[PDB]
Amino acid sequence: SGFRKMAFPSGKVEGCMVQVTCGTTTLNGLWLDDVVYCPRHVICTSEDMFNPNYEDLLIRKSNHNFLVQAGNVQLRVIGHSMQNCVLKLKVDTANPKTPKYKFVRIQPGQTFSVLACYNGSPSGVYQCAMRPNFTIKGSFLNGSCGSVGFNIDYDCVSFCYMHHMELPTGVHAGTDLEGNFYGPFVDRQTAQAAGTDTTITVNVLAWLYAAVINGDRWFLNRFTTTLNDFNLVAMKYNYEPLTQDHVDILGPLSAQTGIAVLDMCASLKELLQNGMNGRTILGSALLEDEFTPFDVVRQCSGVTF
Amino acid sequence: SGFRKMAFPSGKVEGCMVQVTCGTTTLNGLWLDDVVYCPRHVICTSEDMFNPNYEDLLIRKSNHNFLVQAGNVQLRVIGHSMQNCVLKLKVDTANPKTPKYKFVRIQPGQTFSVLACYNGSPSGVYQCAMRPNFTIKGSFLNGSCGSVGFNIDYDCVSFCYMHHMELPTGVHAGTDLEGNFYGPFVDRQTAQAAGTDTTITVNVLAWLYAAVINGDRWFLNRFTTTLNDFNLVAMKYNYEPLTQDHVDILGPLSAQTGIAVLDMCASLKELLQNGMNGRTILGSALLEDEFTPFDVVRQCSGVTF
Numbered sequence A, B: 001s002g003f004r005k006m007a008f009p010s011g012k013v014e015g016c017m018v019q020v021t022c023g024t025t026t027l028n029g030l031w032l033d034d035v036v037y038c039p040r041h042v043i044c045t046s047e048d049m050f051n052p053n054y055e056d057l058l059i060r061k062s063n064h065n066f067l068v069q070a071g072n073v074q075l076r077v078i079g080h081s082m083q084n085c086v087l088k089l090k091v092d093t094a095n096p097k098t099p100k101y102k103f104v105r106i107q108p109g110q111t112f113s114v115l116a117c118y119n120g121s122p123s124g125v126y127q128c129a130m131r132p133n134f135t136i137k138g139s140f141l142n143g144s145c146g147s148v149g150f151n152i153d154y155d156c157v158s159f160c161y162m163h164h165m166e167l168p169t170g171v172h173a174g175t176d177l178e179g180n181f182y183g184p185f186v187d188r189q190t191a192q193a194a195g196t197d198t199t200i201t202v203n204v205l206a207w208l209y210a211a212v213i214n215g216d217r218w219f220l221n222r223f224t225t226t227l228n229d230f231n232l233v234a235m236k237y238n239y240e241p242l243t244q245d246h247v248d249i250l251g252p253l254s255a256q257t258g259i260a261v262l263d264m265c266a267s268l269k270e271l272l273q274n275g276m277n278g279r280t281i282l283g284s285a286l287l288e289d290e291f292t293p294f295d296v297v298r299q300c301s302g303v304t305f
């Protein structure tokens, strides 16, 4: 028992982190087989980042202008190209620690682990969610760019995020590993802001099932609701609409606990309309929305990698 | 910017996890050089665990009764001994992935990362604190025993915890790596309960400094206080006494922000006496006490390993 915000073990990703320097700009890269992936603004000086022409800046660079360091070892760059907002640096050595991996683009509401890195060295690991407004609530400083987010399934690392920038209010934005931004953001130092965020309804429901499994049951009421009537109530409280797909992914937790999804919705509806009256759920005074249904099943069943 | 509950990168520890089976009992072990460390109740059947005589159970075991598996490879056990509540299994192969390490006994109030494992394979990593009542608020299932807690300092892993048992209310108890329990607990399946816990005052203060650094400043008031008068107020709210040693370890955060420790104490005093009135600090509606001062400096300064 117990329920914690849990990250994936980071070792498989640690073995892929490198340092990339171009000129005086340094950030992190991801070394998979004989390719290093990193944010393209490594080729910018401080003055270039407000209105960069990346194609022009890249045309002026040769392979040898990129200093790639894996630990205390320089990797020789033998090719380079740009794909959307990432650079791909071909190196003459394949990373022997390359895990089985794929590149995935995740959906808003899905969670992943971030391995925050500086100068190619890991600082820490934490779990976060792709918010409905396409930001993440991370913890990132200068030099953190190129840190990656990932999920693990058995032996396979699915990379889903590479870090590029910080938006107002201390939230973070980045790309998939093909260099395409999540959300409407661009890698330029300009006036950009995230849209209004929304609470991830299906994740709150998943976390309420986690609470029941841990014996924190006070919020269960005696009612049910229709999906439509729940969604009318949730809307006012800035919760996203609950879809039938969301209901379906809650199926395993509903079957395990015997609590119909729409019954849990009735209990959540009451929490939104009446508050928690100084009570906590799994130690939290606010409803938590950064556990997916699969996160709850993994943690409560002890899935390993 | 941003502030997250952050774990250490787990890779160095992942490389040390193994599976230990004796009879039909399986749990995790820690493989460092040519020794595997694991909880001694691996030698118990289900019926032995209520009133075990570990010395007697161990006398009946030979080296070959211990099946140690590192991945898909069996490690030959060539010696065995018991030290307090841990078994030490000498194996004929040294772990090539052994990091620089030490064994430390941590103090209540200090934090560490846990790599939760089952059958020698990692499930997840999370950050926790040794509570004043010598439990941790973890997430552990059947078969999790032998999972370890640790800190990292540059290249050196300080192992401080090995998991043994779950107490009422879903909190967890274990030993240092010399097999000595934290707290008054014994590795026997008997009626045991943790004492009343207390809030880790110095950690709450550290987290309030983290809030200031992130620009969440609303709670700063215009007053100071004496250490004695603060401790009188904190006592009623089940906060531990703040010592001069605690004041001293807050020094770096106090110097960085220019907020005297006793001034922050005056602000905390007001939060305890008046509540937060529906406000949050760093997104939390409750005061957080599982960041140490050094945790805050590490995260806000980007310390790497």
Ligand SMILES: *C(=N)[C@H](C[C@@H]1CCNC1=O)NC(=O)[C@@H]1[C@@H]2[C@H](CN1C(=O)[C@@H](NC(=O)C(F)(F)F)C(C)(C)C)C2(C)C
Pocket (backbone or CB within 6 Å): A027, A041, A049, A140, A141, A142, A143, A144, A145, A146, A163, A164, A165, A166, A167, A168, A172, A186, A187, A188, A189, A190, A191, A192, A193, B001
């Ligand atoms: C990459 N190492 C950093 C990571 C930042 C630094 C502070 N916290 C982070 O997460 N990325 C940048 O510095 C990028 C880089 C130029 C400017 N920038 C920003 O993150 C800036 N933000 C924006 O311009 C905004 F608001 F549009 F997102 C900054 C004001 C420095 C936080 C480029 C190319 C975006």
Ligand SMILES: *C(=N)[C@H](C[C@@H]1CCNC1=O)NC(=O)[C@@H]1[C@@H]2[C@H](CN1C(=O)[C@@H](NC(=O)C(F)(F)F)C(C)(C)C)C2(C)C
Pocket (backbone or CB within 6 Å): A001, B027, B041, B049, B140, B141, B142, B143, B144, B145, B146, B163, B164, B165, B166, B167, B168, B172, B186, B187, B188, B189, B190, B191, B192, B193
């Ligand atoms: C080790 N793999 C498990 C970990 C437990 C299982 C459920 N959650 C955990 O953290 N440890 C045990 O099963 C130990 C083992 C016998 C009994 N036990 C317990 O944790 C039990 N608790 C106690 O006996 C109590 F309350 F005293 F702590 C249990 C009721 C199964 C949770 C021994 C030798 C302590």
